[PDB]
Amino acid sequence: GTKKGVSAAAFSGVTAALGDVGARWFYTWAADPQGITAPAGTEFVPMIWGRDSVTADQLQRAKAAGSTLLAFNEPDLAGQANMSVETALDLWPQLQATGMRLGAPAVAYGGDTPGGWLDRFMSGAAARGYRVDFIPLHWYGGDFSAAATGQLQSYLQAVYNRYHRPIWLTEYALTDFSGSTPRYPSAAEQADFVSRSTAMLNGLSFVERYAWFSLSTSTTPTGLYTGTTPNSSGVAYRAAG
């Protein structure tokens, strides 16, 4: 359908790469496409990344660039938006007042955990009569076996069960962050995971959209393309339909 998207940055060849891979949507972690010209049929989704992104100017920019709005990126991490639940909720009315379909902040992990960041955000939002239309999630698997897709599915199901909001998977890949440096799968393991995970996500009715992290190897070792050339993972992602 229209589920398959990617995160992207401007690199030489990005327009070609978005069209080649069949991305129906994309985002840039910013309020506008950050210099990317989208192919026809590829929808841009703006993001309000952190506390300092919440300005009349950024919110007007976002509304001019797209119709769906993603909120803060990994507020639960000191290295990312680094925001208390209270701060996110206090800023929420400015994002709500755009009128756009509105995604929760994307937590790095523990979205299903009672008392965790997302739980306290969703409980506070309900108590304040706020609108949260969908929940975007991040998932990085450290088990590089064929079991990985079912572990991803379990997390998405858990979050769906807890808040009953449609799910977006705005970043996912196999990456183990448990050690002092990141661990990555082999190219074959990564391509097999792309195939099996996309088949799973295409069939899961409460997942509206997904986005592999990320389109370009300039962004991450789990990239799908180097310039306009897909690797075996890009090939598998293109084939996901």
Ligand X SMILES: OC[C@H]1O[C@@H](O[C@@H]2[C@@H](O)[C@H](O[C@@H]3[C@@H](O)[C@H](O)O[C@H](CO)[C@H]3O)O[C@H](CO)[C@H]2O)[C@H](O)[C@@H](O)[C@@H]1O
* Contacting positions for ligand X (CB under 6 A): 28-30, 34, 49-50, 52-53, 73, 80, 219
In angstroms, what is the minimal distance from the CB of 88 to ligand X? 14
Whole-angstrom distance, CA of residue 93 vs CA of residue 165: 19
Question: What is the per-residue burial (b if ≥16 Cβ within 10 Å, else e) of 185-215?
Answer: beeebbbbbbbbbbebbeebeebbbbbbbbb
In angstroms, what is the minimal distance from the CB of 52 to ligand X? 3
- Treating both helix axes as pointing N-terminal to C-terminal, what angle do 117-128 and 148-163 enclose, rounded to 10 degrees? 30
Nearer to ligand X, 118 or 160 (CB): 118
Nearer to ligand X, 17 or 192 (CB): 17
In angstroms, what is the minimal distance from the CB of 175 to ligand X? 12
Nearer to ligand X, 104 or 160 (CB): 104
Nearer to ligand X, 54 or 195 (CB): 54
3-state SS of 92-121 is HHHHHCCCCEEECCEECCCCCCCCCHHHHH
Contact 196, 237 (CB under 8 A): no
Whole-angstrom distance, CA of residue 238 vs CA of residue 181: 29
In angstroms, what is the minimal distance from the CB of 34 to ligand X? 6
**Cα distance between the two ends of the chain:** 8
In angstroms, what is the minimal distance from the CB of 121 to ligand X? 18
Nearer to ligand X, 53 or 217 (CB): 53
